[PDB]
């Protein structure tokens with residue numbers, strides 16, 4: 002499926018993919034091996050879909066938080082660099098790409114969000130979130146606004162949720178406790194409430210996304226944005242005299258961004274693993290290779306010691322690391338996918354008014370901790386106890402809810418439907434839905450009765466967890 006004798010690379014559309022293609026051109030000139038760089042939409046979801054069957058790119062780039070899930074799924078080749086190469090990168094960046102004792106990617110660069118501000122509109126940026134409402138009032142009187150940033154991805158709101166105490170998974174005695182989630186504690190609620198209050202008081206708009214915020218800052222319409230180093234080169238080309246600085250404090254506490262390590266993994270199905278390693282170690286992870294990417298879109302604080310010694314003198318990188326040091330490196334555990342999905346739903350629902358802050362975060366807390374368990378019940382006590390005839394009928398009844406074509410209704414197995422069903426009906430909702438759909442099927446009445454019992458069992462187990 003994957004073509005032998007060339008390299009296909011996937012990297013996100015906000016990174017320096019034209020600079021990476023230039024590294025690939027040098028590789029081709031030395032070796033004759035052509036290197037194609039692509040930036041597919043929804044890359045972090047598309048890779049595990051195609052790689053599951055042995056398709057996809059030779060090399061996948063993403064922040065390290067997704068890579069434990071990919072490795073658990075067997076989608077990644079183990080990385081075994083010689084000690085001489087391993088010593089060229091900072092040890093903590095190798096930690097970010099180690100999963101169950103195995104290196105599963107090459108670390109490239111350390112990313113953290115900073116406060117970016119327009120020095121002509123705002124010579125002295127605010128030290129606190131709490132000052133921003135008054136600043137917005139003052140700027141609105143000049144036809145401007147104080148702050149716009151992407152409110153569709155929870156990555157950008159996390160620094161504020163985490164500031165007063167919110168967390169993802171508790172790190173306890175050397176490992177993450179996948180049952181101890183910190184998204185509905187008092188600190189998380191306080192931060193999300195402040196965000197929702199900014200929207201209620203017309204200092205931000207719930208529909209603001211990456212493109213809208215970037216355009217508004219780079220056109221000089223808003224005084225501040227929150228973004229990572231990849232954003233700097235577009236501001237450079239704009240007319241904005243900008244600075245990069247520490248994020249504002251909340252309730253006197255630093256904002257705590259999730260720190261990501263841009264990482265490159267090798268597809269377990271690649272027939273080009275030797276070439277992919279040669280490209281990543283000896284073409285990309287060099288001063289000249291990282292510079293080629295960095296001049297396109299800045300990487301942040303790179304993992305390669307020799308080149309970071311040059312970048313560290315840049316005040317923008319100093320600000321990036323100051324923010325990174327106030328935050329936490331993301332876990333790479335497989336549960337991160339469910340965490341991000343739950344938190345994305347909570348922030349969007351709270352910002353839009355669809356849910357209160359308390360209700361939105363309570364659901365995200367339960368579902369980040371318990372989605373896997375509800376899915377196990379749905380699969381093993383629901384779908385695997387019904388025959389193919391009834392499974393086909395249930396897929397037909399779910400066709401509108403899950404968007405299933407006739408071919409999808411034909412090809413999708415019980416594991417896939419379980420995944421899709423819980424994405425649509427999060428947590429306990431997926432059990433309720435199957436119970437509702439199978440209430441009236443005569444041959445499934447026994448199956449349905451036990452699902453009610455299973456639903457009750459986990460409800461008890463969920464409470465014993467919280468107290």
Ligand SMILES: OC[C@H]1O[C@H](O[C@H]2[C@H](O)[C@@H](O)[C@@H](O)O[C@@H]2CO)[C@H](O)[C@@H](O)[C@@H]1O
Pocket residue numbers: 013015045064065066067112154155156157229261341
């Ligand atoms: O919003 C949740 C999202 O956050 C992170 O994605 C970041 C990425 O790390 C940055 O490099 C940049 O591209 O922005 C993304 C947010 O739009 C996580 O890495 C990702 O897994 C998670 O879904």
